[PDB]
Every structure is written in C-alpha cells, then in structure tokens.
Amino acid sequence: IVGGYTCGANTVPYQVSLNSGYHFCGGSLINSQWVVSAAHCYKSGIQVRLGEDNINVVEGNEQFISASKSIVHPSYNSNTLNNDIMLIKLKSAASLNSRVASISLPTSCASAGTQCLISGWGNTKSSGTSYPDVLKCLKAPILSDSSCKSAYPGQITSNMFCAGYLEGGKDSCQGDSGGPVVCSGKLQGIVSWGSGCAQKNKPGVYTKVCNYVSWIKQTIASN
Ligand SMILES: C[C@H](/N=C/c1cc(NC(=N)N)ccc1O)C(=O)O
Ligand SMILES: [Ca+2]
Ligand SMILES: [Cu+2]
Helix, strand or coil, X not given: CECCEECXXXXXXXXXXXXXXXXXXXXXXXXXXXXXXXXXXXXXXXXXXXXXXXXXXCCCCCEEEEEEEEEECCCCECCCCECCCXXXXXXXXXXXXXXXXXXXXXXXXXXXXXXXXXXXXXXXCCCCCCCCCCCEEEEEEECCHHHHHHHCCXXXXXXXXXXXXXXXXXXXXXXXCCCEEEECCEEEEEEEEXXXXXXXXXXXXXXXXXXXXXXXXXXHCCC
16 A cells, blocks of 8 residues: 555554465455455465464464465456456355454445445555555545546446556555455455556546446355
C-alpha cells in the first residue's frame, strides 16, 4: 500500500496473509473455512495466517491454518487477468473472534464513487521498495467505468473496476495482491493489477467480486 496509513492491530479482522515460507499475498476470510484471494496468487503449500498485524512477530492473536484445497476460477485467464479470483479452503475451521472475523459477500455491485478500504502488507514505495511488517490501509474511491477504460485501453473487462486516485500517490502494490477491497461492509474487490504503483493516470485494477457470488456459493456448497 502506497500513501496509506497503519490500520491498527486487528482492525481488519477478515484480512489474511498467505504464507509459503514468507508472506506472498493477501486474502479475505469469508467464513470459518474459506478464503478469497486472487487467482494469480496461486501456488502450492499455502498456509493461511489469520489474526495478523506484524507478520514477522508472533503477537498472540494469530491462527495459522494450512490450506487443504485451492480452487482457481474455471475461466481465469492469466494473460488478461480476467476472472482473477481463487477460493482457498482451510484444513480446519478458524476460531472466529473479535480479531478473526469473516467479511460479508455482496448482494449487489458497488457504486462508482463509493469510498472503500484496501489493505495489505505490500510495497509502500511508488519508486523503490519497502515492505512493512504491520498491516497498511488505504481509503480509495471506485473510479468511473469511463475513466478506468481510458486508463487501460482495451484491457478492462466487465469483471474489473478501477479504484484510487488518478493524480497518483495512493495505490495498492506488489504484495497486496489477493487482498480485500471492502465497500459498505462488503467484499467488492480483490487486489488484482495495474501499471506500477501510485503512478499518475494508472489506478489499481480490481476483480469485481459481485460477479462471482454465484460461483463462490456453488463452490463452497460442494467442497
Ligand atoms: C508483483 C506482481 N503483482 C503486482 C500487483 C500490483 C498491483 N498494483 C498496481 N499495479 N497498482 C496490484 C496487485 C498486484 O499483484 C506479480 O503478481 O508478480
Ligand atoms: Ca504476527
Ligand atoms: Cu500481482
């Protein structure tokens, strides 16, 4: 997260860290046994870490649970990043509490202009590299469909939406990948892609979760 703020320990209870010997992606807890992340974050040997703030220090509220199954969307296209969503099932149910909680899935898509909360442990530099140990947060508005398509000609599908600031300075970045974009208390987006970080006229692009609720529900209903 570039140009954001320190969230505050466990203030984003649904935020998870995907670990494969190190933090490599974010994710969102949608219920005690399932996590929603980006399909491009896929890899084997994933351990889901919940209740995390500083990912390099055991602070006492964490829950480490290995993934038992990963399900990348059937139509995920890594070339275009269309359908960049993946479900991860935990080997065991997480113990839900005040610091580890699920985030509700949307019933309707978010409206352009809505201010959402983006979070993660990704790069905090626009030009250069610096990874925080504690969770970072960013308040960012959903940009217009028109502005999004103009920023990335011929690359924005109906399963994507842009959020951020065209003037640059505030954006998600490498490492926040797979993380949440919450608007009005609903998981409306997944940190997916963009062009660099916090660059002018190049806002972050996010997977439009509201288009996948049927697939998510059917999938967790049979797995
Ligand atoms: C590191 C690289 N992902 C970069 C990445 C960048 C953004 N942000 C942005 N350009 N505004 C969001 C999600 C991402 O996964 C990768 O998958 O190898
Ligand atoms: Ca920790
Ligand atoms: Cu990425």
